[PDB]
Amino acid sequence: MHTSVRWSETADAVKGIRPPVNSLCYSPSGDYVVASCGVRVLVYAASTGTLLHSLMGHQDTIYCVDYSSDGKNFASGGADRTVIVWSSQGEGIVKYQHTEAIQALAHNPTSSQLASVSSVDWGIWSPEQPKVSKYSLPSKGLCAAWTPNGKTLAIGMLDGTVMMLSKTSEEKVIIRRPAPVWALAFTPLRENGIDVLAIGSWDQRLSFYNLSGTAVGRERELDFDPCSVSYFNDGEYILLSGSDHKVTLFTKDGNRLIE
Amino acid sequence: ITYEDGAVIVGGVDGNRYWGRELPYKLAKVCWGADGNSILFGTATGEVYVHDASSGEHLSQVEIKCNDGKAPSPLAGLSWHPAWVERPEPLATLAVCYQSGKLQLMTSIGDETPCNVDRDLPAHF
Fold it and tell me: What range(s) does the IFT122 first beta-propeller domain occupy (chain A) (predicted)?
């Protein structure tokens, strides 16, 4: 497996510091690429990466960016206490504030509405209902992941509390991780009808947990701290990135194959 | 066994009811997935969905392009022949036909390049 760079961009340095590319998104069609540099959302093409859109609506730096499975509207979350919902052309849908900060944006591949993860709790914003219920959380969340069938939502937390807070079933299966949970994802390829969640715990460990809260297989050690989970070839492999300054491809078991 | 209200009952050979549901939309045509693990339903409006054989939840929706989308056209044919389930490049054995007469031959649940061939005459079966 040979890997070669096709195109590469770089955010311009401001005051000697280049703002990080915290999030990245690919369209389900496979053409639109959404990145977030500074306070500005940027849009590129898959083949060439030409700068199509340069949206400037967030007052502060952008942490989380998510893309919808339809391929029409993507939402970007900046550190300005407010989630803004955007369209492909650049028209904001709604600009609704959160309490202190926002952390993650997750889009269900089946239903249109998304779930935002923020300081106070995770809000459920829907196009039909602008009203979002507010409740307390022990602290601010880190990441989120919806099931490919929309069954359950997993919230990745620094203290390790991964909760199966699903609207369909109020039952919760609690995962405990000593390490921060910075990147967790649900597999799109289910074998024998098993719902599996891959968690990149920041003790250099990668774990698999089913919907029953059982450690699937074993806990795999890593030569870095993963901060971005993804799957390759629709569940065939798993893509990981972290403090190694390298992108690594693993089997579904968890063994290392190739950087 | 599917009805007009959307109610579906999947029965076994002997009669053991595997699962029954009351789907919200009005069903008009029903097919069987080629592999045997998916069930394709058709609405009264003309939309087509893919559900699970066992659980029966709303797995996905078929990407249609022969349907204009201006008005809900009823469908007259929905058949997926399983002769090439274990084929390296499965043939366009899926068939979706509307009452107008637009025939769309797909090779998978979400095929992006169907061999849609149009005919002037209408269609019923």
Answer: 21-188, 192-259
Range(s) of the domain holding residue A193: 2-259
Contact B57 A149 (CB under 8 A): yes
| CATH number (domain holding residue A232) | 2.130.10.10
Experimentally, the structure was elucidated by: cryo-EM
CB contact under 8 A, A110 and B58: yes
Q: Which amino acid belongs to residue B9? A: I
Distance (Å) of CA A45 to CA A50, A52, A62, A64, A151: 6, 8, 20, 20, 32
- Pick the residue of A111, A149, A195 with the most B CBs within 10 A to test the interface with B by mutation: A149
Q: How far is residue B122's CA from residue B67's CA, in Å, rounded to a whole number?
A: 14
Task: Give dist(CA A34, CA A54) in Å, integer.
Answer: 10
End-to-end CA distance of chain B: 19
Q: Which residues of B touch A (CB under 8 A)?
A: 54-55, 57-60
Min Cα distance B121 → chain A (Å) is: 34
User: What's the domain count of chain A?
Assistant: 1
Resolution of the experimental model, in Å, one decimal? 3.4
Q: Give the DSSP letter string of A135-166.
A: ---SS---EEEE-TTS--EEEE-TT--BEE--
Query: Checking DSSP bridges between strand B75-80 and strand B94-98, what pairing results, if any?
Result: antiparallel
